[PDB]
Amino acid sequence: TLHNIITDTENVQGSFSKHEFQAETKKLLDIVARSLYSEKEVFIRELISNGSDALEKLRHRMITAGGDAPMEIHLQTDSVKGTFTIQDTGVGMNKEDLVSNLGTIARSGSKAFLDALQNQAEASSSIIGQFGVGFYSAFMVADKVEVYSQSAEAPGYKWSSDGSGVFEVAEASGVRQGTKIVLHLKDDCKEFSSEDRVKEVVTKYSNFVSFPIFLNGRRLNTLQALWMMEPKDISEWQHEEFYRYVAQAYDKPRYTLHYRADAPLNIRSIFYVPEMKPSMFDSSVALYSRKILIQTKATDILPKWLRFLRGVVDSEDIPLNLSRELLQESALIRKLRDVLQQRVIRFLLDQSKKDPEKYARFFEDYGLFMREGIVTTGEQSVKEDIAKLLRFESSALPAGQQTSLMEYSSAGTRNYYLCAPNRHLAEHSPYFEALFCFEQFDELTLLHLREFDRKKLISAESEQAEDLLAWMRNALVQRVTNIKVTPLDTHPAMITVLEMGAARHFLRTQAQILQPTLEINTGHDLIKKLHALKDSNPELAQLLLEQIYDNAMIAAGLNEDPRPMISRLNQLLTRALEKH
Amino acid sequence: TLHNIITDTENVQGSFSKHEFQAETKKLLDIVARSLYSEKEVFIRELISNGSDALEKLRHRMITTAPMEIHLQTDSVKGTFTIQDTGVGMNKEDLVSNLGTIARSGSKAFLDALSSSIIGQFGVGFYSAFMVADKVEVYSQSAEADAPGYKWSSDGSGVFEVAEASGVRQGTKIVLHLKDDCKEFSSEDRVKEVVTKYSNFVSFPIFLNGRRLNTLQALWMMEPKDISEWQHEEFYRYVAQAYDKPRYTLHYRADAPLNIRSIFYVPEMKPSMFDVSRSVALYSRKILIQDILPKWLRFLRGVVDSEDIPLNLSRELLQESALIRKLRDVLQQRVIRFLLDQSKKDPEKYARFFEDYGLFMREGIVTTGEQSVKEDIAKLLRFESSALPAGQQTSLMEYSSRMKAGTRNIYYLCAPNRHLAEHSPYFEAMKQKDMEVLFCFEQFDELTLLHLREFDRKKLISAETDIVVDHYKEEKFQDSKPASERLSSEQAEDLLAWMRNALVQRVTNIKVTPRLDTHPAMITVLEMGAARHFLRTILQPTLEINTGHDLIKKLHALKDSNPELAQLLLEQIYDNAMIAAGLNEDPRPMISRLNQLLTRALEKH
Ligand SMILES: Nc1ncnc2c1ncn2[C@@H]1O[C@H](COP(=O)(O)OP(=O)(O)NP(=O)(O)O)[C@@H](O)[C@H]1O
Ligand SMILES: Nc1ncnc2c1ncn2[C@@H]1O[C@H](COP(=O)(O)OP(=O)(O)NP(=O)(O)O)[C@@H](O)[C@H]1O
Ligand SMILES: [Ca+2]
Ligand SMILES: [Ca+2]
């Protein structure tokens, strides 16, 4: 059935013809100035980053060949003339620099600058540009672009282009040291002559730019990149502020993890666990690089189960996509994710020690995420790492108290859980008579776990009544699957269930078959009464039977909402109080 | 107050010079190889699209015959990936011009207007081969003139050599000498994965290593009336990656505000409760792109194509998020209409759908800002009614249209089931009015109606709420029982006084109500729904008693004859009333109090 036409049949005949690749410049502009980014607004991000680079370069040159203005990014909107303007007080550009850097696509003076630095210099980690195309994103939104630039040298210039394959350059007077870029906005892009709009964009992408940013004379970016500062020299109130900002929330972080590492990768990061539990009516961690936003929802840096974390991750040597809203597929990113997952797990274990009470609450609220982690990830090594966070009750421990899976195993022991709705049902299991996982998805969780600690874990799964016994089976027909006697004290009866699967598959139903078994205490003065009132008062006996049964179901946690019984109970009480 | 440096002070001195834009060619090639596509694998998509273009160009010119296929071959030994197409090929000046020049697209200049089949556009996809390859060889036969075959060759150095060659078949063959880095693309299973993912709907047949791949019809682009039930079942299973079938299918086409070609399926399966806690493919020109639906419509599976969405150069991003919000709103409106239509066509089937997917409506209502969208979604909700018989579902619309002209509100009552609603103490009270009352039985119905607030400018008010408001109006309500069967005002006063002492710190108020019949008492709270919700993490509760009720009269009698029993009874009545109110905490602690009440009451029996 095979059909392949591919065959080694070709032979070159003759020689020569060496050619150089070329570039259709006019179309390449158009690509850059249109087809690169998801949203037009990104041109602000690009021009501010460029201005930041011009300031960073000035700062760096003055370390050594020191000189004397303030280092600032200024924005101005003109809604009437329909312009947007940005000015920096940076190194500026001479004529040669404008023709070269602005007039050549893919040429990056800032990349050249970066390559020539001592790799330890502070400018090494803060210069943003590398691709040599960002500036052309202005033509995304503008028919005319004007650049006024004064070098920090021994003549000011104006660079001008409509974005159609040509530009002009003339000498300019009255040009302040640095660079002024004026965009004559297109009709459909006039929203960028709106102050509120430009403000939105600056704070979205450029809020943590090193240098101060002014819009129409007013400072904006008062927030500092906490993730780049020394952990122990940050306050509790600053995290509170920063968390809220980056999480877009209004509560506190209940956990803060400030993780810096130069080690497997450059990592400057902060992670928060919200104080508030998430629920039925609901951002993630954001990815930055050199203080500039890449993704508000970082996709490939953390596992999926860790998405309950808010915060920030910034690497400076992470390979960026040309759009600067994506990462390139890389072994570094698959490692960073492995590193962050292990670091966050170690952090949460440390918290289960520092404050086991507090961790308990955190596992109530977010423990569903670990459970998901175990069921999803393929790596068996990792499944047992996440399983270190799980908490349950034990057969041997008391109620309301939990333990980790790593609580030893006590001699030969080489494998012991019963997933049940609640305590009372578990302690009365047939298969318990040989761990207590009361939470939902606990079964499915350990069923995917399969092993922990190389160890194992498998689903541990007088005669005066008789008439009464036989009578109740005639009243509660197809409600229970059996009725028996029991030696119970304060309770007239109790409800026990055999298969724990049958109890789950029943609470999800909002008769229902689960083969429930009702055990009766013939030492109770209610059962004693029931026996008598059987023949003495059949209609009162019926009411009292259904109550005792209902009561036992409630006490077993198999009747959470007793609304159905209230009318009938009221009737039993009046009948029962007829006497008094 | 202000600090602004920008001033209109720059003036041009003297003449200027004109310049042309230039390009750093080697660095642009670097960018395409290393920084343009976020995933290496899409070099396969780009080469296949390029080959598909060469075939459409041949077909077009073949309206002046030959076979028209795409061949992939993977040499694991030699570390080689090959693609051959039988299309229009290219001559020497075509090789030199189109392959040698970045951002040059033959498949663009070609567009003599009439097709919508051509994919090429940007002029860079071919160079995506250098993501994964040290060396690329191209063999191309122009198939036009007395034109020779040619071999184009490049190591990715910014240089390429061209010689004329023999035994070059009609079309183009591209050989990638893969990098040790990416030898996965000489794996047949791996290369198949990539074709299935991006190029599964390509027009022409694609063979991998001699086996024809199971490419599909792009169903969403076709005439809705020509697609059989069974064709939808198959496509559903493909796009959802499912093993069941659709219960609803919406094939939606529009040119109107936006170009839309889409298919939406609602699975026959109930959504997994685990998957809800933890959806639709987006295409252009038969090639896959990667929210578009509102989050509450994430239960839909299916596909969306729109020619108005512009692609980015990487072909993985969309380019006007105002366009997407517009598209999202249009689809949401259409899906709502569609489901309303299905409610009318088959109400029985829609009950099943509502029962299995209702939670998504409720979510969408609770999480929307815009009231109009809340009310749009709320059209999908179904309830029972005090007007209609048991079992019969209704909507807010049918409630609205039943409303007498003067009536200003929509009354509801939330209970577990019909029987409890019908015999609810809160409904007994509403029955004294002649207003219709909606009956809502799902867990989060009340929460949904609190967030909904109003519908068609009519306020949503619970029975329980409206019962409290009627206190601060004229009672006006007369007891169901005559004065003969009730406690005298003097015995009632005495009983309240005693009850106030026995429940001191548990109730704000105790008072009699004439608005009950069957029940001894009830708990009222103005904001009952809100209270009920908050309890799903004391109050200011009011207990209202029925002095015609036998249990209450007996309570009044017991407080003097058997005070301990009287207090025990009162505790259970208040407990009972809190349960009926849906305000009870753990009911288990009471079971002990109840058993010791029951024994002591049944003690003279
Ligand atoms: N405001 C400015 N002041 C001084 N020089 C500038 C300014 N803006 C741009 N330049 C120079 O022009 C070059 C080209 O900028 P651009 O074309 O945006 O590429 P890039 O910003 O360097 N890299 P990217 O932003 O990643 O595309 C920069 O590298 C600078 O050397
Ligand atoms: N297999 C082929 N057969 C014939 N012509 C081809 C083939 N592959 C490429 N070409 C020609 O070379 C041109 C350049 O291709 P390429 O550089 O990939 O740009 P593109 O395919 O037009 N657009 P995109 O894929 O969106 O970058 C195409 O537009 C065709 O004219
Ligand atoms: Ca440039
Ligand atoms: Ca090209």
Residue numbers in the entry:
A (entry chain A): 85 to 152, 154 to 239, 242 to 369, 376 to 503, 507 to 511, 513 to 531, 540 to 566, 591 to 616, ...
B (entry chain B): 85 to 148, 153 to 202, 209 to 372, 377 to 388, 393 to 639, 652 to 719
Paper text:
To determine where calcium binds in the closed state and any consequences on the structure, we replaced the magnesium in our standard zTRAP1 crystallization conditions with calcium. Despite the similarity in overall structure, no density coordinating the β- and γ-phosphates, where magnesium would be, was observed. To unambiguously determine where calcium binds, we exploited the anomalous X-ray scattering signal from calcium and collected two datasets: one at 7450 eV (1.664 Å) and 11111 eV (1.116 Å). Using phases from the solved structure without the contribution of calcium atoms, the resulting anomalous difference density map reveals one strong peak within the nucleotide pocket of each protomer, located just above the α-phosphate (inset). The density is tightly coordinated by six oxygen atoms in an octahedral arrangement near the “lid” of the NTD (4 backbone carbonyl oxygens, a tyrosine hydroxyl, and the α-phosphate). Rather than being a magnesium mimic positioned to stabilize negative charge build-up on the β- and γ-phosphates at the catalytic transition state, direct visualization of the calcium-binding site by crystallography shows that calcium occupies a site near the α-phosphate. In the closed state, the calcium is octahedrally coordinated by backbone carbonyl oxygens from the ATP lid, Tyr-221 hydroxyl, and the ATP α-phosphate oxygen. Unlike the magnesium site, this site is configured quite differently in the apo state versus the closed state, thus providing a unique coupling between open-closed conformation and calcium binding. Structural data supports that the calcium-binding cavity near the α-phosphate presented here is conserved in the GHKL (Gyrase, Hsp90, histidine Kinase and MutL) ATPase superfamily. The remarkable change in cooperativity observed with calcium indicates that TRAP1 can adopt a switch-like response to calcium at high ATP levels, providing a strong connection between calcium concentration in the mitochondrial matrix and TRAP1 ATPase-driven cycling.
In this study, we look at how a mitochondrial homolog of the molecular chaperone Hsp90 (TRAP1)2 may be regulated by calcium binding via a novel mechanism. All Hsp90s are homodimers with each protomer composed of 3 globular domains: an ATP-binding N-terminal domain (NTD), a middle domain, and C-terminal dimerizing domain (CTD). TRAP1 structural studies have revealed the presence of a remarkably asymmetric closed state in the presence of nonhydrolyzable ATP analogs that leads to a two-step sequential ATP hydrolysis mechanism, with the first ATP leading to a flip in asymmetry, and the second leading to re-opening. We found that unlike most other Hsp90 homologs, the TRAP1 ATPase can efficiently utilize calcium alone to support hydrolysis, and that the relative preference for magnesium or calcium depends upon the concentration of free ATP.
